[PDB]
Short mmCIF file of C-alpha atoms and ligand atoms in Angstrom, two decimals:
data_model
loop_
_atom_site.label_atom_id
_atom_site.label_comp_id
_atom_site.label_asym_id
_atom_site.label_seq_id
_atom_site.Cartn_x
_atom_site.Cartn_y
_atom_site.Cartn_z
CA UNK L 1306 -0.09 0.07 0.08
CA UNK L 1307 2.22 2.83 1.40
CA UNK L 1308 5.25 0.87 0.26
CA UNK L 1309 5.27 2.70 -2.75
CA UNK L 1310 6.44 5.67 -0.70
CA UNK L 1311 9.11 3.80 1.01
CA UNK L 1312 10.70 2.96 -2.24
CA UNK L 1313 10.80 6.20 -3.60
CA UNK L 1314 12.04 7.54 -0.45
CA UNK L 1315 14.94 5.00 -0.57
CA UNK L 1316 15.33 6.02 -4.27
CA UNK L 1317 15.91 9.50 -3.11
CA UNK L 1318 18.80 8.52 -0.43
CA UNK L 1319 20.44 6.14 -2.93
CA UNK L 1320 20.54 8.95 -5.81
CA UNK L 1321 21.79 11.58 -3.26
CA UNK L 1322 24.39 9.11 -2.32
CA UNK L 1323 25.20 8.17 -6.00
CA UNK L 1324 25.81 12.11 -6.64
CA UNK L 1325 27.90 12.60 -3.57
CA UNK L 1326 30.12 9.56 -4.28
CA UNK L 1327 30.63 10.66 -8.10
CA UNK L 1328 31.68 14.00 -6.63
CA UNK L 1329 34.11 12.55 -3.97
CA UNK L 1330 35.76 9.93 -6.43
CA UNK L 1331 36.57 13.08 -8.93
CA UNK L 1332 38.19 14.71 -5.83
CA UNK L 1333 40.06 11.47 -4.73
CA UNK L 1334 41.62 10.89 -7.93
CA UNK L 1335 43.12 14.40 -8.34
CA UNK L 1336 46.00 14.80 -8.78
CA UNK L 1337 47.39 11.33 -8.18
CA UNK L 1338 44.76 8.73 -9.55
CA UNK L 1339 43.46 7.92 -13.16
CA UNK L 1340 40.24 5.72 -13.60
CA UNK L 1341 39.91 3.77 -16.78
CA UNK L 1342 36.89 1.39 -17.16
CA UNK L 1343 36.56 -0.32 -13.68
CA UNK L 1344 40.29 -0.06 -12.91
CA UNK L 1345 42.03 2.72 -10.79
CA UNK L 1346 45.58 3.76 -10.65
CA UNK L 1347 46.87 5.75 -8.01
CA UNK L 1348 50.51 6.52 -7.40
CA UNK L 1349 52.28 6.96 -4.03
CA UNK L 1350 54.13 9.81 -5.56
CA UNK L 1351 57.63 8.44 -4.66
CA UNK L 1352 60.16 5.69 -5.95
CA UNK L 1353 60.88 2.34 -4.61
CA UNK L 1354 62.79 -0.85 -5.74
CA UNK L 1355 60.07 -3.34 -7.16
CA UNK L 1356 59.90 -5.80 -3.94
CA UNK L 1357 59.20 -2.81 -1.90
CA UNK L 1358 56.70 -1.18 -4.43
CA UNK L 1359 54.96 -4.57 -5.03
CA UNK L 1360 54.74 -5.25 -1.03
CA UNK L 1361 53.15 -1.61 -0.67
CA UNK L 1362 50.50 -2.25 -3.15
CA UNK L 1363 49.50 -5.66 -2.09
CA UNK L 1364 49.32 -4.54 1.74
CA UNK L 1365 47.01 -1.60 0.32
CA UNK L 1366 44.73 -4.50 -0.86
CA UNK L 1367 45.67 -3.71 -4.86
CA UNK L 1368 48.75 -4.58 -6.86
CA UNK L 1369 51.25 -3.12 -9.07
CA UNK L 1370 50.07 -1.21 -12.36
CA UNK L 1371 49.05 -4.07 -14.74
CA UNK L 1372 47.90 -2.27 -18.01
CA UNK L 1373 45.95 -4.85 -20.05
CA UNK L 1374 44.99 -2.61 -23.11
CA UNK L 1375 46.19 0.38 -24.93
CA UNK L 1376 43.53 2.30 -23.02
CA UNK L 1377 44.75 1.25 -19.74
CA UNK L 1378 48.39 1.95 -20.72
CA UNK L 1379 47.57 5.54 -21.86
CA UNK L 1380 45.78 6.14 -18.43
CA UNK L 1381 48.77 5.07 -16.52
CA UNK L 1382 50.91 7.17 -18.95
CA UNK L 1383 49.30 10.32 -17.58
CA UNK L 1384 50.66 9.69 -14.01
CA UNK L 1385 54.06 8.84 -15.29
CA UNK L 1386 53.99 12.03 -17.13
CA UNK L 1387 52.61 14.00 -14.35
CA UNK L 1388 55.14 12.82 -11.89
CA UNK L 1389 57.86 12.96 -14.68
CA UNK L 1390 59.04 9.43 -13.12
CA UNK L 1391 59.15 6.15 -14.86
CA UNK L 1392 57.15 3.47 -13.00
CA UNK L 1393 57.30 -0.14 -12.36
CA UNK L 1394 54.72 -2.37 -13.89
CA UNK L 1395 53.62 -5.64 -11.82
CA UNK L 1396 55.08 -8.12 -14.51
CA UNK L 1397 58.14 -10.38 -14.27
CA UNK L 1398 59.84 -12.99 -16.21
CA UNK L 1399 61.64 -14.12 -13.07
CA UNK L 1400 60.38 -17.61 -13.09
CA UNK L 1401 61.10 -18.35 -16.80
CA UNK L 1402 63.51 -15.84 -18.45
CA UNK L 1403 61.91 -14.29 -21.45
CA UNK L 1404 58.30 -14.91 -20.54
CA UNK L 1405 56.65 -12.01 -18.70
CA UNK L 1406 53.74 -12.86 -16.52
CA UNK L 1407 51.26 -11.10 -14.15
CA UNK L 1408 51.33 -11.80 -10.68
CA UNK L 1409 48.72 -14.75 -10.99
CA UNK L 1410 51.12 -16.31 -13.28
CA UNK L 1411 49.35 -15.61 -16.47
CA UNK L 1412 51.17 -14.61 -19.66
CA UNK L 1413 50.81 -11.15 -21.00
CA UNK L 1414 47.78 -10.18 -22.94
CA UNK L 1415 48.87 -6.99 -23.83
CA UNK L 1416 52.52 -5.39 -24.18
CA UNK L 1417 53.92 -1.84 -25.46
CA UNK L 1418 57.60 -2.53 -25.44
CA UNK L 1419 60.02 0.18 -26.78
CA UNK L 1420 61.99 -0.88 -29.83
CA UNK L 1421 64.67 -3.39 -29.02
CA UNK L 1422 62.93 -4.42 -25.97
CA UNK L 1423 62.80 -6.59 -23.90
CA UNK L 1424 66.48 -7.51 -24.23
CA UNK L 1425 67.64 -8.73 -20.65
CA UNK L 1426 70.62 -6.18 -20.41
CA UNK L 1427 73.57 -7.70 -18.49
CA UNK L 1428 71.63 -10.93 -18.41
CA UNK L 1429 69.43 -9.50 -15.31
CA UNK L 1430 66.46 -7.64 -16.45
CA UNK L 1431 63.28 -9.23 -14.86
CA UNK L 1432 61.00 -6.40 -14.07
CA UNK L 1433 59.16 -3.94 -16.50
CA UNK L 1434 59.26 -0.08 -16.41
CA UNK L 1435 56.93 2.39 -18.32
CA UNK L 1436 58.27 5.45 -19.40
CA UNK L 1437 56.87 8.96 -19.88
CA UNK L 1438 56.20 8.25 -23.58
CA UNK L 1439 54.05 5.21 -22.45
CA UNK L 1440 56.76 2.50 -23.93
CA UNK L 1441 57.99 -0.40 -21.80
CA UNK L 1442 61.41 -1.67 -20.75
CA UNK L 1443 62.54 -4.55 -19.07
CA UNK L 1444 64.91 -3.30 -16.18
CA UNK L 1445 66.63 -4.64 -13.32
CA UNK L 1446 64.33 -5.03 -10.15
CA UNK L 1447 66.68 -3.77 -7.78
CA UNK L 1448 66.43 -0.01 -9.36
CA UNK L 1449 64.01 2.57 -7.91
CA UNK L 1450 61.03 3.51 -9.90
CA UNK L 1451 57.51 5.39 -9.31
CA UNK L 1452 55.01 3.51 -7.06
CA UNK L 1453 51.70 3.05 -8.91
CA UNK L 1454 49.20 0.63 -7.86
CA UNK L 1455 45.97 -0.37 -9.29
CA UNK L 1456 42.58 -1.16 -7.49
CA UNK P 633 4.79 -8.83 1.59
CA UNK P 634 8.28 -10.22 0.71
CA UNK P 635 8.73 -6.78 -1.20
CA UNK P 636 8.25 -4.87 2.12
CA UNK P 637 11.11 -6.95 3.51
CA UNK P 638 13.30 -6.25 0.71
CA UNK P 639 12.93 -2.50 0.92
CA UNK P 640 13.66 -2.69 4.85
CA UNK P 641 17.12 -4.70 4.15
CA UNK P 642 18.17 -2.14 1.48
CA UNK P 643 17.47 0.62 3.78
CA UNK P 644 19.76 -0.87 6.25
CA UNK P 645 22.33 -1.31 3.83
CA UNK P 646 21.90 2.30 2.64
CA UNK P 647 22.29 3.70 6.15
CA UNK P 648 25.53 1.74 6.66
CA UNK P 649 26.91 3.13 3.47
CA UNK P 650 25.60 6.55 4.42
CA UNK P 651 27.46 6.49 7.72
CA UNK P 652 30.54 4.72 6.41
CA UNK P 653 30.92 7.28 3.65
CA UNK P 654 30.36 10.39 5.94
CA UNK P 655 33.61 9.54 7.72
CA UNK P 656 35.57 8.97 4.49
CA UNK P 657 34.45 12.51 3.28
CA UNK P 658 36.36 14.10 6.35
CA UNK P 659 39.47 11.80 5.75
CA UNK P 660 39.56 12.44 1.82
CA UNK P 661 39.43 16.17 2.42
CA UNK P 662 42.25 16.28 4.66
CA UNK P 663 44.62 18.01 4.45
CA UNK P 664 44.26 19.34 0.92
CA UNK P 665 40.43 19.75 0.53
CA UNK P 666 37.78 22.23 1.53
CA UNK P 667 34.03 21.70 1.42
CA UNK P 668 31.79 24.81 1.09
CA UNK P 669 27.96 24.29 0.23
CA UNK P 670 27.97 21.90 -2.49
CA UNK P 671 31.31 22.61 -3.83
CA UNK P 672 34.76 21.16 -3.34
CA UNK P 673 38.27 22.90 -3.65
CA UNK P 674 41.22 20.59 -3.63
CA UNK P 675 44.87 21.75 -4.17
CA UNK P 676 47.18 19.47 -6.34
CA UNK P 677 50.00 21.01 -3.75
CA UNK P 678 52.00 22.52 -6.43
CA UNK P 679 52.45 25.49 -8.64
CA UNK P 680 52.05 25.91 -12.60
CA UNK P 681 51.39 28.36 -15.01
CA UNK P 682 47.58 29.21 -15.67
CA UNK P 683 47.41 27.32 -19.02
CA UNK P 684 48.84 24.11 -17.39
CA UNK P 685 46.76 24.51 -14.26
CA UNK P 686 43.55 25.09 -16.21
CA UNK P 687 44.29 21.59 -18.09
CA UNK P 688 44.80 19.77 -15.14
CA UNK P 689 41.61 20.68 -13.56
CA UNK P 690 39.51 20.25 -16.51
CA UNK P 691 41.06 16.98 -17.26
CA UNK P 692 40.43 15.71 -14.01
CA UNK P 693 36.58 16.53 -14.51
CA UNK P 694 36.70 19.83 -12.78
CA UNK P 695 37.82 23.55 -13.10
CA UNK P 696 40.06 26.20 -11.61
CA UNK P 697 38.87 27.64 -8.32
CA UNK P 698 35.79 29.87 -9.17
CA UNK P 699 34.71 31.32 -5.72
CA UNK P 700 31.05 32.78 -6.63
CA UNK P 701 30.32 34.43 -3.10
CA UNK P 702 32.20 35.53 -0.25
CA UNK P 703 31.56 32.13 1.69
CA UNK P 704 33.51 30.17 -1.16
CA UNK P 705 36.20 32.91 -1.32
CA UNK P 706 36.61 32.48 2.19
CA UNK P 707 36.87 28.62 2.04
CA UNK P 708 39.23 28.82 -0.75
CA UNK P 709 41.28 31.30 1.30
CA UNK P 710 41.47 28.69 3.99
CA UNK P 711 43.50 26.35 1.61
CA UNK P 712 45.43 29.03 0.39
CA UNK P 713 46.57 30.09 3.58
CA UNK P 714 47.15 26.78 4.82
CA UNK P 715 49.69 25.90 2.04
CA UNK P 716 50.79 29.43 2.30
CA UNK P 717 50.77 30.17 -1.49
CA UNK P 718 48.55 32.31 -3.81
CA UNK P 719 46.48 30.60 -5.99
CA UNK P 720 45.21 31.02 -9.69
CA UNK P 721 41.35 31.40 -10.29
CA UNK P 722 39.72 30.32 -13.30
CA UNK P 723 38.71 33.71 -14.45
CA UNK P 724 40.45 35.91 -17.13
CA UNK P 725 39.94 39.00 -19.19
CA UNK P 726 41.94 37.48 -22.22
CA UNK P 727 39.05 37.75 -24.51
CA UNK P 728 38.24 41.30 -24.03
CA UNK P 729 40.66 43.53 -21.96
CA UNK P 730 38.92 44.49 -18.62
CA UNK P 731 36.01 42.15 -18.99
CA UNK P 732 36.84 39.38 -16.65
CA UNK P 733 34.62 36.01 -17.30
CA UNK P 734 34.34 32.44 -16.17
CA UNK P 735 35.68 29.60 -18.47
CA UNK P 736 31.91 29.51 -19.52
CA UNK P 737 32.14 33.27 -20.71
CA UNK P 738 29.70 34.46 -18.18
CA UNK P 739 30.49 37.86 -16.24
CA UNK P 740 31.65 37.58 -12.58
CA UNK P 741 28.99 37.29 -9.99
CA UNK P 742 31.31 38.02 -7.25
CA UNK P 743 34.63 39.54 -6.81
CA UNK P 744 37.20 40.50 -4.12
CA UNK P 745 39.78 42.71 -5.66
CA UNK P 746 42.67 44.30 -3.69
CA UNK P 747 42.11 48.23 -3.77
CA UNK P 748 43.27 49.30 -7.19
CA UNK P 749 42.99 45.83 -8.93
CA UNK P 750 42.84 45.04 -11.55
CA UNK P 751 45.22 47.23 -13.03
CA UNK P 752 46.50 45.11 -15.97
CA UNK P 753 50.14 46.12 -14.84
CA UNK P 754 52.64 46.51 -17.90
CA UNK P 755 49.63 45.88 -20.07
CA UNK P 756 49.77 42.26 -19.63
CA UNK P 757 47.98 40.70 -16.78
CA UNK P 758 44.84 38.69 -17.85
CA UNK P 759 44.57 35.88 -14.87
CA UNK P 760 43.77 36.27 -11.42
CA UNK P 761 45.61 35.27 -8.29
CA UNK P 762 43.88 34.92 -4.79
CA UNK P 763 46.44 36.05 -1.83
CA UNK P 764 46.66 34.59 1.60
CA UNK P 765 44.36 37.41 2.90
CA UNK P 766 41.66 36.43 0.41
CA UNK P 767 42.20 39.51 -1.89
CA UNK P 768 42.19 39.21 -5.67
CA UNK P 769 45.05 40.64 -8.12
CA UNK P 770 45.14 40.43 -11.83
CA UNK P 771 48.34 38.99 -12.81
CA UNK P 772 50.43 37.56 -15.82
CA UNK P 773 49.14 34.07 -16.85
CA UNK P 774 52.74 32.72 -17.29
CA UNK P 775 53.57 33.19 -13.56
CA UNK P 776 53.42 29.96 -11.58
CA UNK P 777 50.52 29.66 -8.71
CA UNK P 778 49.20 27.01 -6.71
CA UNK P 779 46.79 25.02 -8.63
CA UNK P 780 43.49 24.54 -7.02
CA UNK P 781 40.61 23.00 -8.80
CA UNK P 782 36.87 22.70 -7.75
CA UNK P 783 34.61 19.91 -8.09
CA UNK R 208 5.58 -2.28 -11.24
CA UNK R 209 6.92 -1.58 -7.70
CA UNK R 210 8.79 -4.94 -7.66
CA UNK R 211 10.65 -3.95 -10.78
CA UNK R 212 11.58 -0.75 -9.08
CA UNK R 213 12.66 -2.65 -6.10
CA UNK R 214 15.13 -4.84 -8.39
CA UNK R 215 16.44 -1.67 -9.81
CA UNK R 216 17.28 -0.30 -6.27
CA UNK R 217 18.66 -3.52 -5.21
CA UNK R 218 21.09 -3.57 -8.48
CA UNK R 219 22.05 0.47 -7.52
CA UNK R 220 22.83 -0.48 -3.78
CA UNK R 221 25.02 -3.64 -4.84
CA UNK R 222 26.82 -1.40 -7.36
CA UNK R 223 27.58 1.24 -4.69
CA UNK R 224 28.80 -1.15 -2.02
CA UNK R 225 31.21 -2.39 -4.73
CA UNK R 226 32.23 1.17 -5.71
CA UNK R 227 32.65 2.14 -2.05
CA UNK R 228 34.79 -0.78 -1.15
CA UNK R 229 37.27 -0.17 -3.96
CA UNK R 230 37.14 3.76 -3.13
CA UNK R 231 38.31 3.12 0.39
CA UNK R 232 41.28 1.15 -0.63
CA UNK R 233 42.34 3.97 -2.96
CA UNK R 234 41.76 6.76 -0.35
CA UNK R 235 43.86 4.94 2.25
CA UNK R 236 46.83 4.44 -0.11
CA UNK R 237 49.40 5.59 0.95
CA UNK R 238 48.74 7.81 3.95
CA UNK R 239 45.95 6.18 5.76
CA UNK R 240 45.34 3.37 8.11
CA UNK R 241 41.87 1.75 9.28
CA UNK R 242 41.48 0.00 12.72
CA UNK R 243 38.21 -0.83 13.97
CA UNK R 244 35.93 1.92 13.54
CA UNK R 245 38.91 4.43 13.46
CA UNK R 246 41.07 5.86 10.74
CA UNK R 247 44.58 7.48 10.99
CA UNK R 248 45.68 9.87 8.13
CA UNK R 249 49.19 11.64 7.86
CA UNK R 250 48.92 15.17 6.28
CA UNK R 251 52.67 13.86 5.10
CA UNK R 252 54.55 16.88 6.60
CA UNK R 253 55.87 18.26 10.08
CA UNK R 254 54.48 20.83 12.35
CA UNK R 255 54.87 21.91 16.05
CA UNK R 256 52.26 20.47 18.26
CA UNK R 257 49.82 23.49 18.46
CA UNK R 258 49.75 24.13 14.57
CA UNK R 259 49.12 20.21 14.13
CA UNK R 260 46.28 19.89 16.80
CA UNK R 261 44.70 22.78 15.06
CA UNK R 262 44.89 21.10 11.48
CA UNK R 263 43.20 18.11 12.93
CA UNK R 264 40.72 19.82 14.47
CA UNK R 265 39.69 22.11 11.75
CA UNK R 266 39.52 18.92 9.51
CA UNK R 267 36.87 17.62 11.69
CA UNK R 268 38.94 15.13 13.57
CA UNK R 269 41.79 15.12 16.25
CA UNK R 270 45.54 14.34 16.61
CA UNK R 271 46.42 10.64 16.74
CA UNK R 272 45.00 9.10 20.06
CA UNK R 273 45.81 5.48 19.94
CA UNK R 274 43.91 3.57 22.72
CA UNK R 275 44.86 0.09 22.50
CA UNK R 276 47.90 -1.96 21.24
CA UNK R 277 46.14 -2.53 17.79
CA UNK R 278 45.52 1.22 17.30
CA UNK R 279 49.06 1.98 18.13
CA UNK R 280 50.48 -0.59 15.80
CA UNK R 281 48.34 0.84 12.75
CA UNK R 282 49.50 4.27 13.47
CA UNK R 283 52.98 2.92 13.80
CA UNK R 284 52.80 1.69 10.14
CA UNK R 285 52.38 5.36 9.15
CA UNK R 286 55.30 6.49 11.03
CA UNK R 287 57.54 3.73 9.66
CA UNK R 288 56.34 4.62 6.11
CA UNK R 289 57.09 8.09 6.46
CA UNK R 290 60.05 7.34 8.57
CA UNK R 291 59.10 10.34 10.76
CA UNK R 292 58.09 10.24 14.32
CA UNK R 293 54.72 11.82 14.97
CA UNK R 294 52.85 13.80 17.61
CA UNK R 295 50.16 12.24 19.53
CA UNK R 296 47.21 14.18 21.00
CA UNK R 297 47.98 13.46 24.80
CA UNK R 298 49.79 16.07 26.86
CA UNK R 299 50.44 16.82 30.46
CA UNK R 300 50.19 20.54 29.84
CA UNK R 301 47.56 20.90 32.76
CA UNK R 302 49.23 19.01 35.52
CA UNK R 303 53.06 17.80 35.19
CA UNK R 304 53.01 14.15 35.21
CA UNK R 305 49.43 13.41 34.40
CA UNK R 306 48.60 12.91 30.67
CA UNK R 307 45.29 13.61 29.37
CA UNK R 308 43.36 13.34 26.11
CA UNK R 309 42.07 16.49 24.45
CA UNK R 310 38.74 15.92 26.11
CA UNK R 311 40.31 16.04 29.42
CA UNK R 312 40.26 12.28 30.79
CA UNK R 313 43.43 10.44 31.62
CA UNK R 314 45.16 7.94 29.58
CA UNK R 315 43.45 4.36 29.31
CA UNK R 316 46.43 2.90 27.34
CA UNK R 317 50.06 3.79 26.95
CA UNK R 318 53.34 2.45 25.30
CA UNK R 319 56.15 4.60 26.88
CA UNK R 320 59.96 3.81 25.74
CA UNK R 321 61.95 2.72 28.71
CA UNK R 322 62.51 5.52 31.35
CA UNK R 323 59.80 7.58 29.77
CA UNK R 324 58.02 9.97 30.30
CA UNK R 325 60.83 12.03 32.01
CA UNK R 326 60.04 15.50 31.46
CA UNK R 327 63.95 16.18 30.27
CA UNK R 328 64.86 19.53 30.89
CA UNK R 329 61.78 20.15 32.78
CA UNK R 330 59.79 20.98 29.72
CA UNK R 331 58.37 18.00 27.87
CA UNK R 332 54.79 18.04 28.09
CA UNK R 333 53.71 16.42 24.53
CA UNK R 334 54.32 13.03 23.08
CA UNK R 335 55.76 11.47 20.16
CA UNK R 336 55.76 7.95 18.59
CA UNK R 337 58.88 6.71 17.02
CA UNK R 338 59.18 4.39 14.12
CA UNK R 339 59.41 1.34 16.84
CA UNK R 340 56.01 2.34 18.17
CA UNK R 341 57.36 3.43 21.43
CA UNK R 342 56.35 6.82 23.12
CA UNK R 343 58.60 9.73 24.39
CA UNK R 344 57.46 12.74 26.05
CA UNK R 345 58.90 15.60 23.80
CA UNK R 346 58.77 19.41 23.93
CA UNK R 347 55.75 20.70 22.32
CA UNK R 348 57.56 23.12 20.22
CA UNK R 349 59.41 20.60 18.21
CA UNK R 350 58.15 19.70 14.62
CA UNK R 351 56.77 16.06 14.37
CA UNK R 352 54.65 14.36 11.58
CA UNK R 353 51.21 15.28 11.74
CA UNK R 354 48.58 12.38 11.91
CA UNK R 355 45.27 12.65 12.36
CA UNK R 356 42.34 10.42 13.65
CA UNK R 357 38.79 10.43 11.94
O1 LIG H 117 70.45 0.21 -18.10
C1 LIG H 117 69.89 -0.65 -18.56
C2 LIG H 117 69.25 -0.25 -19.92
O2 LIG H 117 70.35 0.10 -20.78
C3 LIG H 117 69.87 0.92 -22.02
O3 LIG H 117 69.27 1.87 -21.77
C4 LIG H 117 70.14 2.97 -21.42
C5 LIG H 117 70.46 4.08 -22.55
O4 LIG H 117 70.89 3.35 -23.68
C6 LIG H 117 69.01 4.71 -22.99
O5 LIG H 117 69.13 5.85 -23.72
C7 LIG H 117 68.42 5.10 -21.52
C8 LIG H 117 67.12 5.73 -21.69
O6 LIG H 117 66.41 4.96 -22.05
O7 LIG H 117 68.14 4.26 -20.46
C9 LIG H 117 69.24 3.53 -20.05
O8 LIG H 117 70.27 4.76 -19.55
C10 LIG H 117 69.09 -0.18 -22.65
O9 LIG H 117 69.82 -1.18 -23.37
C11 LIG H 117 68.04 -0.67 -21.97
O10 LIG H 117 67.39 -1.78 -22.64
C12 LIG H 117 68.55 -1.14 -20.59
O11 LIG H 117 67.17 -1.80 -19.76
O1 LIG H 118 54.32 42.46 -10.21
C1 LIG H 118 52.75 42.55 -10.64
C2 LIG H 118 52.27 43.17 -9.48
O2 LIG H 118 52.87 44.55 -8.83
C3 LIG H 118 52.30 45.17 -7.99
O3 LIG H 118 52.11 44.34 -6.72
C4 LIG H 118 53.08 44.39 -5.85
C5 LIG H 118 53.07 44.18 -4.55
O4 LIG H 118 52.28 45.33 -4.22
C6 LIG H 118 51.90 42.96 -4.27
O5 LIG H 118 51.64 42.60 -3.15
C7 LIG H 118 52.84 41.65 -4.92
C8 LIG H 118 52.06 40.27 -4.90
O6 LIG H 118 52.61 39.33 -5.47
O7 LIG H 118 53.26 41.73 -6.45
C9 LIG H 118 53.93 43.00 -6.44
O8 LIG H 118 55.13 42.82 -5.65
C10 LIG H 118 51.09 45.61 -8.21
O9 LIG H 118 51.24 46.58 -9.60
C11 LIG H 118 50.03 44.37 -8.91
O10 LIG H 118 48.87 45.08 -9.30
C12 LIG H 118 50.71 43.87 -9.91
O11 LIG H 118 50.04 42.66 -10.49
O1 LIG H 119 65.43 15.55 24.79
C1 LIG H 119 65.03 14.77 23.87
C2 LIG H 119 65.14 13.36 24.23
O2 LIG H 119 66.50 13.04 24.50
C3 LIG H 119 66.66 11.77 24.85
O3 LIG H 119 66.25 10.83 23.75
C4 LIG H 119 67.02 10.80 22.75
C5 LIG H 119 67.78 9.32 22.48
O4 LIG H 119 68.46 9.15 23.92
C6 LIG H 119 67.04 8.34 21.81
O5 LIG H 119 67.95 7.40 21.38
C7 LIG H 119 66.08 8.61 20.84
C8 LIG H 119 64.99 7.43 20.52
O6 LIG H 119 64.98 7.29 19.07
O7 LIG H 119 65.20 9.90 21.14
C9 LIG H 119 66.31 11.00 21.45
O8 LIG H 119 67.03 11.31 20.34
C10 LIG H 119 65.85 11.11 26.02
O9 LIG H 119 66.27 11.96 27.14
C11 LIG H 119 64.32 11.59 25.77
O10 LIG H 119 63.70 11.43 27.03
C12 LIG H 119 64.31 13.11 25.44
O11 LIG H 119 62.84 13.17 25.16
CA1 CA H 120 66.34 -13.56 -15.33
CA1 CA H 121 64.49 -11.12 -17.97
CA1 CA H 122 65.71 -3.40 -21.22
CA1 CA H 123 45.01 41.72 -22.12
CA1 CA H 124 44.15 42.43 -18.41
CA1 CA H 125 47.57 43.61 -10.90
CA1 CA H 126 54.97 20.76 32.34
CA1 CA H 127 55.75 17.02 31.10
CA1 CA H 128 61.34 12.34 27.17
#
């Protein structure tokens, strides 16, 4: 009977919440975040070696930036450009040299290697950095790079 | 019948979100945000020339700080004071000298000019900065000022 | 038709719950910590006690006030991450030797380093927490990491 009115009432609160949430999300991502589809990149704004970077992201309930399409890569590139610091991706070929995988162990479904890469320089480049131009380069995991997590 | 129970269950989930979100709004706005009415100012925490500052805000889905009332201007001032750095506003008289407009092209509905301003010093001041005392001054767009966006 | 509107409302709420949960993770990284119903967040810079206290209150919160081992460990994470000791909210400004919260009540938990509090130089009324989580009374005029709780 009057249930129709409890429906409309709830409709109002939900919609006011949707509106405030949309506003607060835009505010949240400025200036250190970028959303693309259902994924959100956020940079910590400082550099760390791979192991440390990876730990910061996992402990925060996410993982290191893992661009899976050209659209995701471009979104990530924006933060790298904004900070003017190359960043680590999540992917490594530590298990089997030459075969880059995501943290889950799955093979890459997208790549944006710079010309000549990956080249395993010095016989010891198992992590991946993304440059300000959005291209990728395998690099030693001990180097320090911008920390960007995805959620 | 069962529809009544469903609506009641949603009401409880909504209440939970509302309370939880209320807390996160405060957390998020600390220390670089300022809420006033339905507007939110947030500083990027660094300085840029007007053109770069404007692009940052627009690409983030907002625009440069545009106080439209004394209340908004006072809220913006609080951030500026806290960061101890003058900030750009969105408004310019780049189109017609002496006529300041918002990015939308509409004339100012509020202003807080320091005495004697705007004065187009050197014949080349088309942007606007807000001081820590909350007053406005027209200024060369090439200068670097604190980036504060509104959402 | 009411049952169809309820279904749409159900969808909206499930979507909001999922988005809010994702958003919380984003907000807390890298400067916040959630413990129980409390959230610590660092401003990422240092200030003297009075200015730090003002920043927190103006933002609708207060300075870090760990009231249990669990809260202290969470706060400790931010301190370690920034590698900067932080001010707590508590002081014995009113009565030497009796530390109190901003409300005025006495401490209900403490984690003092060995030998502390010692009012060194006869003038230490504020509290700092080290990277090791232990507390030391310290001069309020020193500059320490600002960490608020909400
Ligand atoms: O240091 C490992 C790195 O060396 C080479 O790249 C270097 C240089 O040639 C490049 O111009 C700059 C800018 O990209 O980076 C390094 O200084 C390459 O062999 C590269 O594959 C390798 O990872
Ligand atoms: O330099 C442009 C600026 O010059 C004059 O303002 C001076 C001073 O009075 C102001 O407080 C500071 C603020 O940064 O700038 C100058 O030092 C005025 O002519 C002013 O209108 C003008 O924009
Ligand atoms: O007066 C400041 C402070 O001095 C002493 O503590 C110092 C040092 O002894 C400790 O190793 C480190 C711990 O990280 O803290 C200070 O640097 C103590 O006398 C202490 O009570 C006092 O507040
Ligand atoms: Ca290898
Ligand atoms: Ca390799
Ligand atoms: Ca390489
Ligand atoms: Ca002009
Ligand atoms: Ca002018
Ligand atoms: Ca001027
Ligand atoms: Ca004393
Ligand atoms: Ca004392
Ligand atoms: Ca002491």
